[PDB]
């Protein structure tokens, strides 16, 4: 490759390449306005062009790093805006862009991004479709400047399906907004998700992402075999251990590459990866990521003859502890896709602890024989725990689940705020709208991704505000200790009533012309303040106070002054 980039030009295509482009200047110049950017975008295009015209033409050989550094200092608002940013530019090619990595803000201090009305939104689709679009791109990025570029371009494809289908129907707004806040959460999800992985590879190491990598590709690829899932394991890591540095550009070829062998060697990982390496290289990788769990082979004989049965056991654990305790988590993942993947994880430590103590003294084979005995409460009790809770959901709703839930959870950690408690028990009685009527099978694998997403995100703001003590002991654990912590939590008995201050409860007629969502959150906000004045009320005393504020929310609709006080003296007993 002469012209790397004229390669680029050729294999994403010039829409590609323009958004990526944009995409990768705004998480950069996050303190840049959109003309600017535009400005930047379209200059690098025709450059490039002359570039697949003549590759052999003028700075055409330099490398992406090399051209993508000098235009960045081209920015002549570069040294006041910036500051340290432009001090690095006079750094050779190879120290210039690992500075540039270390001066991304993760948090930059932007304003809010405000959602525009629907007539707003389909016009401005419809006056200029191409501004608009890429608007999506450059608030995302300058915000979130880690996300990964494709991703982000597969993003804003889905964010152009809402615009052409809701902006032509009766009802704009009836099918535009709940595919937008669709988008709008999965986006978010997938960057605190991706940040979260980059942190459990800083405090807790190689190994065990090693490990939850082998339990999760061996359950996506469950008819392949354990060097194949090992190599799998070991290129994926580098992989993501790469992508957390920030080089966009050696993260993305890392993942074409991955993704090159793994569509290479197809009949030797799955079958159900068939379709997708047909899909052009900008989505290969992103979809083997989303692609569906294989069948397994059928006749998988049970793990205890090579993990169980045998005299071996002891000395091949010897040999190498991690490829033996591998192998275990290989051959129970590939047979088990519907658990977890942390709980793999617990069950093979325990498997360790044993052959430890075990397999080093006396009978060996005497003392591991009742080891997947220990298995059974552990495989149980997120089985149970789920059986408890979508039940709960089925009988009451999304919105009652929420409520028990925000009672239970405000006993349990009163010392948390209370926008805290009330965002946090109002996504957990979301996770059961979304996979709650999901069969067995793929419960506990979408529990696990989406309360990790919610306990990581309740602990964000801990760690910037903390409170309670034993919040804190249960996200700094382990990741396969992190949910058993949070479900070992019980009423805070060495807890202070909070002060009765009749202000709180003092409600007012906005909320009859308040919206259904804004009613909910003030309704809530008022239940966790009434725990917190007073936490030993029974379920049966509280279902009084809640069905009588119900009542008298409706037959005040200024009424909430006299009668409105008759309650809060009324509910004080
Ligand atoms: C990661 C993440 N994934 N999604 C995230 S927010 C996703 C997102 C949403 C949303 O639905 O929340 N958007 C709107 O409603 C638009 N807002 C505008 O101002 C559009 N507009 C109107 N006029 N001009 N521009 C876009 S901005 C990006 S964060
Ligand atoms: C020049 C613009 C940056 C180039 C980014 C390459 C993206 C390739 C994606 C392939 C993949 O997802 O593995
Ligand atoms: C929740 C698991 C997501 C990742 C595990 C499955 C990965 C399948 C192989 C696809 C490799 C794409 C590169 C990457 O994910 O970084
Ligand atoms: C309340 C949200 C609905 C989900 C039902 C509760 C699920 C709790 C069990 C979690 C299973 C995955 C976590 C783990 O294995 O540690």
């Not at 988590?329 to 360790?352: I, M």
Request: hydrophobic share 35%; net charge negative; aromatic share 8%.
């Amino acid at each position: 490759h002469k012209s790397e980039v004229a390669h680029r030009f050729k294999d994403l295509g010039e829409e590609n390449f323009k958004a990526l482009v944009l995409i990768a200047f705004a998480q950069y110049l996050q303190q840049c306005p959109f003309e600017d950017h535009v400005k930047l975008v379209n200059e690098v295009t025709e450059f490039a062009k002359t570039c697949v015209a003549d590759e052999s033409a003028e700075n055409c050989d330099k490398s992406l790093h090399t051209l993508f550094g000098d235009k960045l200092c081209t920015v002549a608002t570069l040294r006041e805006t910036y500051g340290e940013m432009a001090d690095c530019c006079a750094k050779q090619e190879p120290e210039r862009n690992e500075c540039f990595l270390q001066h991304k803000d993760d948090n930059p201090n932007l304003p809010r991004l405000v959602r525009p009305e629907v007539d707003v939104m389909c016009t401005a689709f419809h006056d200029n479709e191409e501004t608009f679009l890429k608007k999506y791109l450059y608030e995302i990025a300058r915000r979130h400047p880690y996300f990964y570029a494709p991703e982000l371009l597969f993003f804003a494809k889905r964010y152009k399906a809402a615009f052409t289908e809701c902006c032509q129907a009766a009802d704009k707004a009836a099918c535009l907004l709940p595919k937008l806040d669709e988008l709008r959460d999965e986006g978010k999800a997938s960057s605190a998700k991706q940040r979260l992985k980059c942190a459990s590879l800083q405090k807790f190491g190689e190994r065990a992402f090693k490990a939850w990598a082998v339990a999760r590709l061996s359950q996506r690829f469950p008819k392949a075999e354990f060097a194949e899932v090992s190599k799998l394991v070991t290129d994926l890591t580098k992989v993501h251990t790469e992508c957390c540095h920030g080089d966009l550009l050696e993260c993305a070829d890392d993942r074409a590459d991955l993704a090159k062998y793994i569509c290479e060697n197809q009949d030797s990982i799955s079958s159900k990866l068939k379709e997708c390496c047909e899909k052009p290289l900008l989505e290969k990788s992103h979809c083997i990521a989303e692609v569906e769990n294989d069948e397994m082979p059928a006749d998988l004989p049970s793990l205890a003859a090579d993990f169980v049965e045998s005299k071996d056991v002891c000395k091949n654990y010897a040999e190498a502890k991690d490829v033996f305790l591998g192998m275990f988590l290989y051959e129970y993942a590939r047979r088990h896709p519907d658990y977890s993947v942390v709980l793999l994880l617990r069950l093979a430590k325990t498997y360790e602890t044993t052959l430890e103590k075990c397999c080093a003294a006396a009978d060996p084979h005497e003392c591991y024989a009742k080891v997947f005995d220990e298995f059974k409460p552990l495989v149980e009790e997120p089985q149970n725990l789920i059986k408890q809770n979508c039940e709960l959901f089925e009988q009451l709703g999304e919105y009652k689940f929420q409520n028990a839930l925000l009672v239970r959870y405000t006993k349990k950690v009163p010392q948390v705020s209370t926008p805290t408690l009330v965002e946090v028990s109002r996504n957990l009685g979301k996770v059961g709208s979304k996979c709650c009527k999901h069969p067995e099978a793929k419960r506990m694998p979408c529990a696990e991704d989406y309360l990790s997403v919610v306990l990581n995100q309740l602990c964000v703001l801990h760690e910037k505000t903390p409170v309670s003590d034993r919040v804190t002991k249960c996200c700094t654990e382990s990741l396969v200790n992190r949910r058993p912590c949070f479900s070992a939590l019980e009423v805070d008995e060495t807890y202070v009533p909070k002060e009765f201050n009749a202000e709180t409860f003092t409600f007012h007629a906005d909320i009859c012309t308040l919206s259904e969502k804004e009613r909910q959150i003030k309704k809530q906000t008022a239940l966790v303040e009434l725990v917190k004045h007073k936490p030993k009320a029974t379920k049966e005393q509280l279902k009084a106070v809640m069905d009588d504020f119900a009542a008298f929310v409706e037959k005040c609709c200024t009424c909430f002054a006299e009668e409105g006080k008759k309650l809060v003296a009324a509910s004080q007993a």
